[PDB]
């Protein structure tokens, strides 16, 4: 549910511009729970996931 939405939102500029205008509305419409929405609005990436180095000096 959550993953599907994010995937689409990243690819689809229409939906992105729809999301920018009204994030809660768009999210509610895509089935996101309050906790999921709250985490989005508070930037808690940590929670969202719940619900790197490839080199050196020499």
């Amino acid at each position: 549910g959550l993953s599907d939405f994010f995937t689409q939102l990243g690819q689809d500029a229409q939906l992105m511009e729809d999301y920018k205008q009204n994030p809660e509305a768009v999210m509610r419409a895509h089935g996101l729970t309050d906790e999921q929405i709250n985490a989005v609005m508070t930037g808690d990436m940590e929670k969202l996931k719940t619900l790197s180095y490839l080199v050196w000096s020499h």
Partner: protein, 262 residues
Amino acid sequence: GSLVCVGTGLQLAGQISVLSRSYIEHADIVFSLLPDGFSQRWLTKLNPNVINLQQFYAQNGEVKNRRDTYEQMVNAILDAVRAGKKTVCALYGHPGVFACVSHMAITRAKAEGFSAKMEPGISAEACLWADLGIDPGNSGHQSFEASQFMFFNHVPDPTTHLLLWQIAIAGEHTLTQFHTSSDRLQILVEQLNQWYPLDHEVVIYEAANLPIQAPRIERLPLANLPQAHLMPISTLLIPPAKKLEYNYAILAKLGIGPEDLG
């Protein structure tokens, strides 16, 4: 069997090339190194025959040189190539920017007589310029890995935008740790002080990995850096500290001066 190394950019799903996406789609097998589980689900939907390179990182707090992680990655990729698989390596951002797994795989593949190439992608640096509305051309641009900057002799131009990648492990010489200490960071500050004052505004930047995520753009005096909260994805931007001095010497040879500058 052949090799194509591509990038998936920073942002989920949308930031990869149209061509690169097609490479993943048509691949026999994909070896991934992606930021998170969302990016990993997207990939798996794109092509189900994925092998996740993340596994080759030290597991359960074991001491393991990252060189040995990279060697293993590279060897897994080549194993598929050698078997005769049309193989794709998908790394986050640009597959060959501050990432030695792609360059090594490509190099080794060629030497074994396999076809190998790299497709450029969008990097954390590409992301920075945009997020902080900075043109690298304005006063020019410099990049260094943070630890190499400390361990080796590098003099930055203080009129340019200076980047220190992998700041979260600045001065972690063992390559077995995921982060450094505040004492290391303090040594960095004292070193940077050769050029930049202590109150010089620096920027902790982190490009978002998700569409609903704002980027981190945390401004602070240089002195405060050692106390700052840093993450593996963190990049340190050090903005110019100095005025451009006129190259009067060269202007003369050009037979011109400031006033003639269009």
